[PDB]
Amino acid sequence: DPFTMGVITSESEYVSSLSAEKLYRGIVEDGNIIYPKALPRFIEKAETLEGDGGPGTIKKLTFVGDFGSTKQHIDMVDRENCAYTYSVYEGIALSDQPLEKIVFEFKLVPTPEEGCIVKSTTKYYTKGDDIELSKDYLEAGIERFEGFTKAVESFLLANPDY
Amino acid sequence: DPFTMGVITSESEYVSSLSAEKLYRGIVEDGNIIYPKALPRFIEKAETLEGDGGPGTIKKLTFVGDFGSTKQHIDMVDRENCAYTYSVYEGIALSDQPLEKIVFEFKLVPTPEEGCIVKSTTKYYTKGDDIELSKDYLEAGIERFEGFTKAVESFLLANPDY
Ligand SMILES: c1ccc(CNc2ncnc3[nH]cnc23)cc1
Ligand SMILES: c1ccc(CNc2ncnc3[nH]cnc23)cc1
Ligand code: NA
Ligand code: NA
Question: What keywords tag this UniProt record (chains A, B)?
Fold first, then answer.
């Protein structure tokens, strides 16, 4: 009768033209104003429910439309190294596979040629005794996460006055 | 002390290469298999909860990710004229403006040159005594609706074996 758990990691990278510090400040420090400006058709509202922005903080995205809302629980905030981690605990099941949580993580690494390399990771933690997860689902999470980051980067470039 | 209600309509059109009857059959008759194939990163599951497919039927979309699920209540089904209408009643509020319902409507009109003209309409019905709705929200609904139709059309063209 063993105890079983899966951790499934997806990693994706891309090179941003925006500097690491600006991209970091935008998402992590000004998320509450920038998320709805950069994704005005998808994110209706980004707000803080508990805490000051550091580890332990609970933030909340409300989506435009009949897509609900979701809470982010903030795990690591590292300004010096432009690194951010949070967890979502609710509404994360697939129609077949329950999840204990999803963890989202980025590190922005400054490059000379450009702004920075954006390193994004998603980790799905599985509830239960077996595992079934499809390419499309695994890729959807990483693709959405990286998309939020991309939209915030386009916004800040088109609007340096932030 | 009057009774006040707003009906806000958005209409959008585009020309499909796929014939009206194929596009209609795909969404309305085979939605349960085609929605998750055409939008495999967004729609996890499309299923019928009540009824046989005609007016009165309650269908349900489950979204990929922490985006919830939503029910469609089917109002008009017109195979002859390729016309379909349904309503969503739940989770439709904006952060400022409550809605009584959202109605979605398409008519596909066959053209000689191509497949058909896809006419899409969204109607937002407002709960309350005043009205505040922004360009971005109004456009998001119509854009999503028309997007579902576009994804189903690309799929059926790339896969005529359906
Ligand atoms: C699978 C898993 C996740 C997603 C998209 N959710 C998501 N992505 C990124 N950041 C978030 N904060 C709250 N929810 C999210 C899509 C598919
Ligand atoms: C505002 C209103 C609606 C949307 C997207 N919902 C939506 N669009 C189309 N068909 C549906 N069936 C169930 N929900 C929907 C986005 C913004
Ligand atoms: Na909403
Ligand atoms: Na889901």
Answer: Cytokinin signaling pathway, Nodulation, Pathogenesis-related protein, Plant defense
Residue A147 phi, psi (nearest 5): -60, -45
Residue type, B39: L
Q: Which residue segments constitute the domains of chain B, with CATH numbers given?
A: 1-162 (3.30.530.20)
Q: From the CA atom positions of chain A, what is the Rg in Å? A: 16
The per-residue b/e assignment along B112-150, b for 16 or more CB within 10 angstroms, e otherwise, is eeebbebbbbbbbbbeeeeeeeeeebebbbbebbbebbb
Tokens of A27: 């998402």
CB-based contacts of B15, cutoff 8 Å, min separation 6 = B111, B114, B115, B116, B117, B118
Strand ranges of the sheet holding B83-88, from the earlier edge strand across to the other edge: B7-16, B116-126, B99-110, B83-88, B69-78, B58-63, B43-50
Cα of B44 to ligand 4 centre, how many Å?
7
Determination technique used: X-ray
Note whether A140 contacts B42, CB cutoff 8 Å.
yes
Spatial distance between the Cα atoms of B13 and B115, rounded to a whole number of angstroms: 13
As given in the structure block, the two tokens for residue B81 are 């004229």
**From the CA of B90, how many Å to the nearest CA of chain A?**
7
Distance from the Cα of residue A69 to its chain's centroid: 14
Q: What residues of chain A lie within 8 A of the CB of B141, using their CB?
A: 65
What is the residue-wise DSSP string for B31-94? HHHHHHHHSTTTEEEEEEEESSSSTT-EEEEEESSSS-EEEEEEEEEETTTTEEEEEE-SS---
Sequence-distant (6+) residues with CB within 8 A of B37 are: B155, B159
Distance CA A134, CA A128 (A): 17
Q: Are strands A116-126 and B7-16 parallel, antiparallel or unpaired?
A: unpaired
